[PDB]
Amino acid sequence: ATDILFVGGIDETIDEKSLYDIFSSFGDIRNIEVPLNMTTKKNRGFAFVEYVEVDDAKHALYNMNNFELNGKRIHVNYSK
Ligand SMILES: [Mg+2]
């Protein structure tokens, strides 16, 4: 367990704004990274969510792994 989550399988509509409003439910977010495709201006299918608190990351990972966002099932892993 770490305070940084690798999030995969995100729908093309998800950006930093929408992922913050989803993942901020679990606790204080230090940083969110959703790289954009410089051609489509859409995400590349993954993000990093960093919590202040490892306990918040653990709660987020339990609750969001295999959860469905906009009709797509997401993958949540500890990063590092
Ligand atoms: Mg930290």
Word description of this protein:
The chain is of the alpha+beta class. The protein has one domain: RRM (RNA recognition motif) domain (Alpha-Beta Plaits). Helices cover about 25% and strands about 30% of the residues. A four-stranded antiparallel beta sheet has the order 2-3-1-6, with helices on one face. Strands 4-5 form a two-stranded antiparallel ribbon. The termini are close together. The relative contact order is 0.34. Bound molecules: magnesium ion (MG). GO terms for molecular function: metal ion binding; peptidyl-prolyl cis-trans isomerase activity; RNA binding. This is RNA-binding protein, putative. It comes from Plasmodium falciparum (isolate 3D7). Keywords: Metal-binding, RNA-binding. The PDB classes it as rna binding protein. Keywords: Nucleic acid-binding protein containing conserved RNA motifs, RNA binding protein.
